Amino acid sequence: NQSKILTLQAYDPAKVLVFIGGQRVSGFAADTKIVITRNNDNISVHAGVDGEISNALSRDNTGVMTLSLQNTAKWNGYLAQWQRQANVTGLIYLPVQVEGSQGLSLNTIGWIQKQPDLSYGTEVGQMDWEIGVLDAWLSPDQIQGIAAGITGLLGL
Amino acid sequence: NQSKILTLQAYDPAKVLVFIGGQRVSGFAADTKIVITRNNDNISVHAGVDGEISNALSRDNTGVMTLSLQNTAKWNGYLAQWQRQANVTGLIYLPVQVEGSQGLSLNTIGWIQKQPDLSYGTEVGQMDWEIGVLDAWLSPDQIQGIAAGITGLLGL
Amino acid sequence: NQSKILTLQAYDPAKVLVFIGGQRVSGFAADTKIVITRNNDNISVHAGVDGEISNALSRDNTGVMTLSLQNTAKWNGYLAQWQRQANVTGLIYLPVQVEGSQGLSLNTIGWIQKQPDLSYGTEVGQMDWEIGVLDAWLSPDQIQGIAAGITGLL
Amino acid sequence: NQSKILTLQAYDPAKVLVFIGGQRVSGFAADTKIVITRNNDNISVHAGVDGEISNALSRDNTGVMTLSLQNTAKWNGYLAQWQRQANVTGLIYLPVQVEGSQGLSLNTIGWIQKQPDLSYGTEVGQMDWEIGVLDAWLSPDQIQGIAAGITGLL
Amino acid sequence: LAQWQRQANVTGLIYLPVQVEGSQGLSLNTIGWIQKQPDLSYGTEVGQMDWEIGVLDAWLSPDQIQGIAAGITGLL
Amino acid sequence: RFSHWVKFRMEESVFAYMKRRSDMGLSMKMSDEDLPVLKSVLMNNPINIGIRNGGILTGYDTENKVSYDPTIIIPKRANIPTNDLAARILRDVKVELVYNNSLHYVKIRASVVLDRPAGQSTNAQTPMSSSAVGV
Amino acid sequence: EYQDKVVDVEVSLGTQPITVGFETPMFLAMHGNFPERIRFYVSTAGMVADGFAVGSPAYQFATNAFAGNFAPQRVAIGRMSIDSSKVDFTGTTNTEQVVVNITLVKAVKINVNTPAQIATALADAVTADTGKATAVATGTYVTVTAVSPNVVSVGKGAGVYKIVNESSETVATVLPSVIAENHNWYFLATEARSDADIVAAAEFAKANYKLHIYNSTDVDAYAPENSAASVFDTLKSLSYDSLGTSDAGADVDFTEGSVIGAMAANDPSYGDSLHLKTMPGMVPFAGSDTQRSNAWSRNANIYRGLYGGGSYIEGKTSSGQYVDVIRFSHWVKFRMEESVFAYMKRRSDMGLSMKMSDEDLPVLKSVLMNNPINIGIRNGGILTGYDTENKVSYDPTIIIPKRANIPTNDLAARILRDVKVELVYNNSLHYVKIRASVVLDRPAGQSTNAQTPMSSSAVGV
Amino acid sequence: IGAMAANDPSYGDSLHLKTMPGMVPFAGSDTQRSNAWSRNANIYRGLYGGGSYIEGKTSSGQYVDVIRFSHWVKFRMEESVFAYMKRRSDMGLSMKMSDEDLPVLKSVLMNNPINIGIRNGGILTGYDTENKVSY
C-alpha cells in the first residue's frame, strides 16, 4: 500500500482545553502541556504449577496529571490559595476536564497532590503541578465510528 | 569465503500484518512497530556441591507485546472502548496474530495489560500499548527448509 | 562514434508549470525555480560481520519542495493569507502538481511547512517558501517507452 | 509568450518606513536594511513506519528582526538610553511597525534583545541591533485581491 | 530508474546485476540496488541528478591488465 | 453500481471546478497552460477517495507484468480540430481504472491423520525451480 | 449540435483502447462479399459484419495478424470469385463437427465410424436445413456451392478437417487488377497454394518491390536433399526472393498472419532480424533432427520450440540472403525517393524550382544525410568508424557530379544521373560457441615469466 | 534413480553412502568386493545395520558426480545465454557483434550458472599457496 494521511485537520495544541473548577487554564510552558498517567496496571498475571494462567482485573483507577506552567501565571496563585483553603477547612475535591483535539479526552474529579519547587535563575523557570484524579480512563468521545468498530471485534 | 545476500527479497515493514480481534491495525509511529518479549527465561540452572549441574524447564510462557501508535489513530478509541467493556462485563480475552515478513511469527490469545500515558506537546505524541499474550513461542512457519534442518542436529 | 542529441525539443523553463490548489503560480525568482528532495534513503542496508547483508524498504516518502519567488509577486500575499486561514480554521492540505518539460513530474498533496525570511536591500531580494509533500516519488509519465519489464536479469 | 512586468511601480527602499515607538528611524547602513526571520517551523510532521503521517500547528511566533545602522546615527544613542531605562525600571515592550513598499508588512510589539558589537577602524563600521518581535506573521495588507477563497481544491 | 524503483517497492525484488568495464583501469562486477533517489532541480540551465547505487562488494578487479607479478613481489 | 458512481461523481468534480473559475471571471481557456490542471482535479475527488477505501486496485502484477496505476491523458491544443474550437468542445480525455473484487465462495481441504503425520524426505537442498534439459 | 450535459462520461468494461506507422499486408482470398477488389479492415469483428464466416481463411489470417507483438492495426483483403467450395474429411475424427456456415448465419451440427459416413451425414443436414444452397457428398468430401447470387461462407470449428475454396481466375491475372485500385500495401500473401500459383505471385512481387510470404505443408520440404520435388527447390533455382517456412497448419490456420504480425511494426532501420522471434499461434517443428538439417539446406525456415517456448530460427530467403538485409534494401530505396522528392516539391511550390547548376546541386548532401542516413546511424542500423584490418573507414560517402560533366543530351531531357552513395550494414548475432574447462585438483604452478610478451620473432629474413 | 533425480548437481554432492530403498546388501566376501572394485562395478553394501552405496564410480573410472557436474554446467550455461538473446530480440533490439555489447555476456554468465554454483559450494574459489595460483 501507499502512504495515507491519518486525519483531515492537523492537531493544534491551543485547541486542547483544560478546565479546573470551571475555568479554562492558561499559562502553559516549554514543550509539554499535560501528562496523564495511571498508577497501576490493568491486569496482573500469575503463573501456575501446571501451565495455567490466571488473570485478575484491577479495581484501582487513580492516576496523576502533571500540569506545566510558567512562574509568571496567575493560576499559580489560584492553586496556592486553593491549597491553603483546603488545608484550613477540608474541601479538596474539584472537577477536572480535558478536551483533547484528535485524541482521547478526560472527565473526572481531581485534587492537588504535591506542590512543585520554585527555582529562580537566569531564565524564566517552570513549575509542574501534580493533580491526582479519581478515574483515569480515557474516553474516545469526539472520535466518530467507534460504536460500530467495538462490535466488530471477535473473541472467545 | 566471500559476501552473500541472506535473502532474495528485502524485508518490508508494511508487509508485517498485525491482527487484533480479527481486524488489521493501522496507525503505527516512530521507528518501532511492535516489540515481542518474554517474562522469564526458558531454563534455570542450579549449582551442586560436587560439580553437578541440574537444569529445570520453565512452565510459564506469558509475554508482553508493545504496540506503538500515534494519538491520532482510531484504534486508540477502539482499545479504550474494549477496556471499558471488559471492565464492566468480564470478557478480556481476544485473539492476536502477527504475520512477520522474512522473520518469525506469532499466533495466540492476548489481552490488554496497561493503558499508556498521553502527552500533549508541541509535536505529535506517541502511545505504547502493552498487550499481554498467553503463549510467546515464535513460529518459523513461512520460512522453508526447517523440518529437514531440525532432524539434522545431533546431540546426546 | 558520433555525438548524439538526446531530446529533439529543447528544455524550456516556461513549460515547467506549477499548480497549487488549481491555480498557476507566476513570479519566480532567478537561478533555480523548483527544488525537490526526499527526507530519508530509499533502501537501508544492515552489514554483517561475517558478510551476510540484508536490506529494508523505507515506507516514508515525506519530502520538501522549495519555491523561490520575488518580493513583488502577489503569490506571497496569497500564501500568507492561506497560512493565516489554515491556522485559524485547521484545514492545511491542498493539492500540488508539477509538470515537467522534458523530465520527471510530481503530483501529490502538499502543505506550507516553513515561511521564508524577508530581507530589504538595494536590490530586489528573494524569498524561498518551503512546501512539504506527502509523497516525493517522481513519475516518468511524459516519456514514452516500457523497458522496465525488458530490463532486469535478477 | 512575452515577458511581463510584475509591478507597475519600482521597489524604492526609501518607501520602506520603520517605526519604533512612534518615531521614524533614519541612518541605515549599506547592503541590507531589514531582515525578518521566524524561530521555528510553522508545521511539524510526524512520519510513521507504515506510512501514516500527522501534522501539528506551531503556536509560537517569536521572531528576530535585525536593524543595521551606522555608527554616526543618533538612534544608537537612543537605543542605548532606552536599554538603560528599561533595565532600571522594568518596562521593556514598545510597538514596532514596518511598512513595505511593494511587499509584505509587519505590525507587532517588540523589544531589544541583543546589543551589537562596536568596531573602530579605517572606514565607518556597521552595528546590527537585534530586535525580537512577539509575532512574526507577515501581512499582505497593501496588495489588493481576495483569491484565497477562490484557491483551494482541498 | 523511477519505474524500477516503483516496481521493486510494490513487489519486493530489488537486486539486479551491475557490471562496469574500464578502458585502461580497474573494473567492477557485482550485484547492486538503488539506494537513494536524487534531488530534481529546475533552473536556467539543464541540471544534473546523481542516482546513488549501492553494491554488495566493492573490490576492483585488474582483469584487463596483463601480468602476474604478485607472486614475484613480496619479501614477507 | 461502481460504474454509475464513477460517472456521476467524475463529471460533478470537473463541473464544480469550472464553475468556480467562471465566478471569479477567470473562466477556463483551451490552452496548454491550463488544460493540464484537470489531472489534479480528477485525482482529487473521484480517484483518491476510491483508493483509500480500497475500491480501486493499485500496484504491480507479476503474471501480466502490467501495472495497475490509474492514468490520465489530456489533448494538447495542436490536436483539437478547428471545428471543435468554434463549438468550444474538448473530447478524447481518457482515464483508466482497475476494480477490486470481493470474495464469495471458499473451499477447504481438511485431512485427519490417524497413526503418524506424513513424513518428509531428508533432502535439505533448496528446491530447484526448473529442469536443466530444455530440448 | 445540442449537448444536454456540460460533462459527459462514457464508461466501458474489459480494457482500455490501444496508432503507429506500419506496413499493411494484403491477403488474396476467394469470396464474393463485395464487388470491390480490395478493402481495408481494422478488426476481426469488422470482417464478420461483412458476412465473413468465423473460421474462414480470410478470418483466420486476420485474427493471427492482430495477435502479434508487432501487429498492424489495419489489414487488407483481396477478392477472387468463388466457383465452389469443399470440405475434405481425409482424416480420422471422433468428435462433433461444428461447421459454421453463413448465407447472405447458422452453425451446422454433425455427430460421429468412418469419414464416408460423417461426410454423407453433413450433406444430409445441409439439405432440408434454406433450399438455395448446393451440397453433395462425394466419397470422402462435401462440395458446397451457391445456387444464386447469394453470399455463402463456410467456416470451421470443433472438427478435424480443412476447407478448400476453388476459383477459375488465375493469380497471375488477378494481381494486375487489385494493384490498380490501391497500392498502399507491402506484404503479399495468397490463399491459393498451388505450385504454379505461388510461383506466379513471387515473380510479380519481385518486379513490384513487394515482399512475398507463404506457408506450406509439403512433406518434401524436409525430404532428402536429392529430391527436388518441393516448391522450395523451384524458387531456389529461379533465384527469387521470398520468405517461406514449413508448417503443418499452413492450410488449416493460415499462419502467414502470425509471421506478418512480427514484422509489420518493426522498422528496418534497427537492423533487427527474425531470429528467435516468437510467433503466437504456430506449432513447434517435430521432425527429428536430420529432417531439420534437410530443411535448412532447402532455405525452408521452421518454427522450433526450445526451453518451453517457441522460436523462429533464421529468416533466410529462397535465394539464401537473410531477410533483414532484404528489408533494409527496400527501406533504403523507399526513404531516399521520398526525401529527395519531398524537397523538390517544397521548392517547386514556392516558384523557385530547383535548377541544374553547381550552386544548387551540392545541397543534396544535406538532404540525403538528413532523412534516410542520419536515422540509420541513430538506430544502429548503419556502421561507422574505422576498420583496423582492412584499414578503411565506414563513413557514408556521397558524390555529386558537376554541370560541366553532364552530357548535352541530359540537359535537354532535364534529368540528372550518376549520383553515388555508399553504406555499411550492421549484422546481428545468430550463433555462439563456448569452450569451457574444469580443473579437478591443484593445477601445476604457472610460468614465472614477467616480461612484456614480444609480438614477433626476430628472425624473419 | 530415486536417489539422484532431485539431487541438484550444483552442490557437488557425491552418491557415496546414500541409501537405496529397495535393494539388498551384497553378500560377497572381502576378496570379492576387491574384485568388483577393480572392475568398476559398484556394489550396495550394508554396514552397521543400514545399507549404503559405495564409491559411485563409472565404467571409465571417473567419479559419477564429476560426470553429472559437467553436464549441469553445459546444459545450464547455454540456456542462460539463449534466454538473454531471446529477450533482446523480442524487444526488436537484437544483439549485434560490436565491442559495445559483447562484454555484456560476462554479467549473464556470472548470473545464472556461476554464482549459483558458488553459494552452494560446488565451485571452489580463493588462493592456493602450494601452486601459488588463484581459483
mmCIF file of C-alpha atoms in Angstrom, chain C residues 11 13 16 31-38 41-43 45 53 55 57 100 103-104 136-138 140 148 153-154, chain E residues 2-6 8-9 13-17 33-46 49 56:
data_model
loop_
_atom_site.group_PDB
_atom_site.id
_atom_site.type_symbol
_atom_site.label_atom_id
_atom_site.label_comp_id
_atom_site.label_asym_id
_atom_site.label_seq_id
_atom_site.Cartn_x
_atom_site.Cartn_y
_atom_site.Cartn_z
ATOM 1 C CA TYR C 11 14.280 22.294 -22.273
ATOM 2 C CA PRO C 13 11.763 26.590 -18.229
ATOM 3 C CA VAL C 16 7.504 23.694 -16.218
ATOM 4 C CA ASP C 31 18.725 30.940 -10.829
ATOM 5 C CA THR C 32 16.758 27.874 -9.653
ATOM 6 C CA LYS C 33 12.972 27.587 -9.806
ATOM 7 C CA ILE C 34 11.950 24.269 -8.204
ATOM 8 C CA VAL C 35 13.980 22.044 -5.869
ATOM 9 C CA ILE C 36 12.514 18.657 -4.907
ATOM 10 C CA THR C 37 14.273 16.445 -2.359
ATOM 11 C CA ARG C 38 13.331 13.441 -0.244
ATOM 12 C CA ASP C 41 17.146 6.939 1.967
ATOM 13 C CA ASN C 42 15.001 4.578 -0.094
ATOM 14 C CA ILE C 43 16.802 1.379 0.988
ATOM 15 C CA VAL C 45 21.494 -1.834 4.479
ATOM 16 C CA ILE C 53 23.796 -8.396 4.235
ATOM 17 C CA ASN C 55 18.120 -4.637 3.163
ATOM 18 C CA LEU C 57 12.422 -0.843 2.168
ATOM 19 C CA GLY C 100 7.991 18.800 -16.311
ATOM 20 C CA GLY C 103 11.796 15.492 -17.300
ATOM 21 C CA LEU C 104 10.007 13.796 -14.422
ATOM 22 C CA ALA C 136 8.078 12.564 -3.228
ATOM 23 C CA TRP C 137 8.112 9.875 -5.927
ATOM 24 C CA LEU C 138 8.906 11.344 -9.339
ATOM 25 C CA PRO C 140 8.040 9.352 -15.769
ATOM 26 C CA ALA C 148 11.396 -1.965 -17.207
ATOM 27 C CA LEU C 153 18.418 -10.234 -15.206
ATOM 28 C CA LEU C 154 17.688 -10.778 -11.490
ATOM 29 C CA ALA E 2 11.886 5.591 -11.320
ATOM 30 C CA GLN E 3 9.738 2.817 -12.803
ATOM 31 C CA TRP E 4 12.143 0.178 -11.487
ATOM 32 C CA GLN E 5 12.013 1.777 -8.034
ATOM 33 C CA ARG E 6 8.212 1.718 -8.019
ATOM 34 C CA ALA E 8 10.674 -3.050 -6.672
ATOM 35 C CA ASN E 9 8.703 -1.251 -3.964
ATOM 36 C CA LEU E 13 12.637 -7.883 -5.680
ATOM 37 C CA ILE E 14 15.290 -5.154 -5.533
ATOM 38 C CA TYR E 15 18.509 -6.843 -6.711
ATOM 39 C CA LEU E 16 19.883 -6.519 -10.246
ATOM 40 C CA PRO E 17 23.345 -7.175 -11.704
ATOM 41 C CA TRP E 33 20.454 -1.929 -5.921
ATOM 42 C CA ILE E 34 19.009 1.586 -5.922
ATOM 43 C CA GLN E 35 19.699 3.140 -2.514
ATOM 44 C CA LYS E 36 18.896 6.869 -2.701
ATOM 45 C CA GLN E 37 16.962 8.896 -5.244
ATOM 46 C CA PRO E 38 18.465 12.263 -6.251
ATOM 47 C CA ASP E 39 17.031 15.745 -5.978
ATOM 48 C CA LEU E 40 15.418 17.309 -9.057
ATOM 49 C CA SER E 41 16.197 20.979 -9.654
ATOM 50 C CA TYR E 42 14.779 23.163 -12.425
ATOM 51 C CA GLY E 43 16.614 26.304 -13.482
ATOM 52 C CA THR E 44 18.014 28.389 -16.325
ATOM 53 C CA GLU E 45 20.442 25.646 -17.395
ATOM 54 C CA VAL E 46 19.971 21.899 -17.643
ATOM 55 C CA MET E 49 20.840 14.306 -10.957
ATOM 56 C CA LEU E 56 27.312 -5.826 -2.494
#
